[PDB]
């Protein structure tokens, strides 16, 4: 009959919202509606109808062959689980990955599941083929509350993976509290020796979890090496952080020594030692001391061991410097107080100076014992001067590069003590003898010695003491280097190496570009762009600097004028007229400081008296030529006489005029009030032309180093010579002997017949090209011969080919270039062998 | 004799700063010291002993071949500048671009100099080759003060440059004040015809100068065309500037209806006029009155002229818009006041609306003139229904188009006259009979009339008026066009269209990254990045949607589920757990919303009630049967009982079995309190279904849509159907006819034996893929055969294929499908004709 029907009469009346027939006959229906009641929690709804069934839960759903009893570890259903439990089940069933729902609970966090569950039981021991434990799987979640509210369920705390690790060993691997204080109450082992030997704490000095090992050391947990032998301490070094060392050290105080043991090691990377160092230096101004001083004598034995001439002269050198370099960086953090930091309040200190520097002191007279006998044994080999001597000025070469570490550091910024002069004084003779054998060699120990100017301040003559000839391929240095100083030779990077350029007015815009911008950007070969156009990278770079090698030089802003030679330029006087010339000045030669570094010409060149007042040096007396040869001319015949013959006197001030003013102006106060003495006829001239230089020279001559040694550092340049200064502005000419053969012009009734001639071209045409070079702009000042060669010298007015004079001008005396002459004044010499010999001497000089 | 030195032994002792000998026998010497020393300004200096020379100034030098005297332009050298005149010069040179000391002084603002020099005198009229004169080099730069200094000395006004520009000509052009008052003070031409005719004030109204315009015409100035006939007044349209219109008007009001014949024009950018009305708009009431009267004078002109049946389709029309969109425009920013702005303070007006409005009301009584009758037309043609119909419509549809535009300005946003819906009341029949014949159209003309849903609040009206049929092509509209709206069929570009995923958390990284991110930035096919890594452009992007296809109905944050058929899915209703979910329904809109915008399908697909649901549906009945079929079969039988019949009553609350609690809920309130009327017995199960949904469907279904509206608004879509719109989400599918007939299952004892599946085989394999597709999802739902082919099928539970079901179910009744069952039940028809004619009955519904 059609009876069956009224169950469903109930259910449309009263229960058609909730539920359905349970005679569908298919497991797979069931889930169909229950995988969701399962997570809607209807405790009982599940069971109403469910009462009559014919399916079972080990059937199981999707590719995971997963029940819902798994699936009820998400929701919470505790009343169905019990429901499905009340049916029976194998919950720790051979799950795809080796799961079960009590992993699953744990992950969806439902407490009264995992209770209920083991309320019933099912093996926990059990793991993940992936190779977790349910215990592992809460400590890496750290799931505190359930995982104490779990341990009381089961037996052992040797729980492993098949890898073996233990709870123990991933709380601290990461980090975590209270995994421990459960397990220490439950007396699990300290040391638990993974299949590696590894240790709990092992994993922690890898971490930096200080707190957990505040509590292990105190519940007494040992300190032991690996298996291989490593340390745990080995790591908490490379961890960086120090604290957790120092937590260890109050358990141990005995390895506060091992750190200098750490330090004499090579395997690290340095800077490390100084994270940790510099923590604690900063934990106490006893240990502040303690450390220096045990530096001191690691750095003091391998420093004898350094003398002790078996040593490799890699091995205890480089031990030396990472111990002294820190050494250094310390005493600038400086003298600590306890538990803190440099001493604060009060600047002074409780004189450790005795104490820390001692074995120092030792070992400088233990230096001052070899080099004070060494001066004897060099100088005493006065007959005749392998090279134990070269060997060992290397070893010794590591200390001389001490001895500005060490005392560069207890002084000012930049500033030296004299006690290193006074080791100077003592010395000298063999420290000439070294650079007299190692020419190769300053820029790697010596590098810094130089680079003081305080110490130039009188080592300006070690500079000079080694002569010219030297400085060739190393003159060569700065251009096959980048500079060889280290951060010269590199170039850095930026996320924006790029400056946009406005294209039509490029002198002012230029200076509305660069001078909006910063060093660092900068200090590099960056790439440039048009305002609104790119510009093909190197293209418009080329283009930027050759019109700027055009703007620069134009009377653009009323700003350089060309010299009385011609095809070159100095600054107009003048250009004070337009208050702006500095911004321009500071601009050029931040221009021109890029033209250098890397390295690609420009189209310009300047007289010599440009090129002396940047290199620093005072501008010579008969540089003076090229600004007037009537003048010039006429002091020349001065510097013959005296007082004593020309009948006249110098009235020390004269009409200065200038400014539309003949500004009556004394020589000097003091300088004003005196006569014209013998020796003074130089002497007050060069005055008058640094006092023809000061009036427009002197502001506008330092607005533009300010803004030239932006790249590149002033002190670099004290190689240089400043007529071998040009070649990097303007690339190596190419020595055109052939057309200069084909247009040498002669004079004193002079033509090549002359045998003095013929003795000429014989000794030139065996020159170098670095000597070469010089003779054309040593007579003629400028250097370019045009594009076509040496016949088109145009001598800037009417074209002067040049012109070689000899005249009877003694031959007890050197020449004289008249220069924008175009010619080289020189001596008959009487014969050949006076003329190939002394012609030399006539013309190096 | 020595004495010779005399000189400069005076020279020496108070001469020789200042000065050197002028004995060098060479002019190019004296230029080479007194080229600085002019620009010295050493006003004495230059002639102390210049007394003694033989060195004439008429001699140049630089390239330019240019004297000192030049030079003493610059420095302002007077002095030294009458020194120069004393030995004599021809200043006015043939120098080298036909300049002059005079011009160069001019740029160097050396007033003393210019006097000095025309103290004497030399031609000022004189040019450059360039072009210019000394008064015009004065008037682009606008000197002022030394050009009013200046004309005393000169002759005439008629100065021009050879291309007959004078400096009047200039000033304007350029914009300044002086340089007119000063020529006006002259008695120069005011309107000095150029070559070209031009005039100054020619100039002025392509410029702006407004204040300089109102001195002009205060002045005198006459108003007249170019020789080639435009005016002046075409070009301060093109500046755009009014107050200079306005500064005009007051001179010649007569103009003011000039701009209503400047409109009626087309050769201009349209926008300009509204700078132009804008601005004068805001210059007063009386004024905003005016120009809207006009302008729908002309508007009420045209339109008459668009009924001027000889006028083309193309001129008449698109005069209109272009007045009546300003018109539009001008009344969004509304009511003026004088000399401002609208009326601020009183929210009213002063009745404008009839005197403003008027000749629209005749355009529309005329309008109505022609509808009126139309609709007698084409409906009196009964027994018969080129076309002037059509032409005819196409005219008018542009004013049909108007009479949206006129009406939708004067209410809030949005809201509609009904005064537009009275039109409608009358002339329903003749806008069906448009459509009727104008499929091709509405995206044009009406394209608004739809957009409005309130208007669609009826005019879904029309929308079901015209059947499916005519959609087919224009659903593809929406494929092979963008969208066919505009804002659609376009897409935008910025600088940053650029998003960066994190890619082991695409699901929760995505929702990290897309909501940090604005709406116009995306709406457009954007590229995408990895967090650090690039993605190759559209690969990363195929990667992101396609790992999301994954990501999204995952069981990743307890989000989804699979629906009963299974290869589908339908939201979880237990989402709620976990607030964030709503933040995932938004962004899943989000996400999908680009998938259709750049069209490319997602590897999903979802069930029949998510779309409806999407589209804006009520869900009907029979959409339930993929829920549960428990329900839904025995639901069936009581739609064919009644309350007579089946001896049971729904009550009306129920156990709402949810959150773990049989929450005794009822229907609705007053829904409580009855019994079941036999009318309502699927009229409250609609209900339950609807609270079926609402207690998880409708918070969640409207967070999803207003994340997916972002990138589609909501009423491009109501073309679709739903069975069609999924073919965007997936592609169309490869009509398997060939391995359908592999595998077609048969029952009711029942092989292709029988004519009647011979019968069925012989319609279907004439079926359009436009509804054989149909039939396929029509019977499975679902619609994707696997890869293989459609012997792929594995019915979700156990591999049923599709089966033909024929029954004696009555011929005189259609078919249903049992969907899940992949079954389609059918009549036996009796016969061949009746199978092959009624067949088709039962399977297009």
Known sequence: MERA????????????????????????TAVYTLMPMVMAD??????????????????????????????????????????????????????????TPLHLAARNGQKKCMSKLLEYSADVNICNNEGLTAIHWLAVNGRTELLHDLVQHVSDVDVEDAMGQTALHVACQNGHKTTVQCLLDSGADINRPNVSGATPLYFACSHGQRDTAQILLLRGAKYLPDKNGVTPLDLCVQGGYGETCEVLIQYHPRLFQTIIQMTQNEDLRENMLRQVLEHLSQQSESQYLKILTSLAEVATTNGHKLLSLSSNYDAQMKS???????????????????????????????????????????????????????????????????????????????????????????????MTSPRFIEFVCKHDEVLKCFVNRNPKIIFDHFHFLLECPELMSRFMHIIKAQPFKDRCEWFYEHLHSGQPDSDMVHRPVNENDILLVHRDSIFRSSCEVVSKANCAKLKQGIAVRFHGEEGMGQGVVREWFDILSNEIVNPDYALFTQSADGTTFQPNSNSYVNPDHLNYFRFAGQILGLALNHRQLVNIYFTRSFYKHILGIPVNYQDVASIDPEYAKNLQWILDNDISDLGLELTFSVETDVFGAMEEVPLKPGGGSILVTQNNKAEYVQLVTELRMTRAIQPQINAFLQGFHMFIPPSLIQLFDEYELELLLSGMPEIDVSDWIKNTEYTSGYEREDPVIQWFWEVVEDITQEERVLLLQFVTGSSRVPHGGFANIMGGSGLQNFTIAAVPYTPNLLPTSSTCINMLKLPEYPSKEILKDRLLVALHC
């Open 5 to 28: 029907m009224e169950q469903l009469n109930r259910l449309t009346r009263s229960l058609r919202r909730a539920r359905t027939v349970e005679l569908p006959e298919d497991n797979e």
């Open 42 to 99: 209807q405790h009982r709804s599940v069971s109403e109808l469910l009462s009559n069934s014919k399916f079972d839960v080990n059937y199981a759903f999707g590719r995971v062959k997963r029940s819902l009893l798994h699936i009820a570890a998400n929701c919470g259903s505790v009343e169905c689980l019990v429901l499905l439990l009340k049916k029976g089940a194998n919950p720790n069933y051979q799950d795809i990955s080796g799961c």
């Open 320 to 414: 030396l410097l990472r111990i002294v370099r820190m050494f250094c960086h310390v005493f600038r953090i400086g003298p600590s107080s306890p538990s803190n930091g440099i001493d604060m309040g009060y600047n002074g200190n409780k004189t450790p100076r005795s104490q820390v520097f001692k074995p120092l002191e030792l070992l400088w007279h233990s230096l001052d014992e070899w080099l004070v006998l060494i001066a004897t044994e060099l100088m005493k080999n006065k007959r005749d001067s392998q090279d134990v001597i070269s060997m060992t000025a290397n070893r010794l070469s590591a200390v001389i590069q001490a001895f500005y570490m060490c005392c560069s550091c207890q002084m000012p910024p930049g």
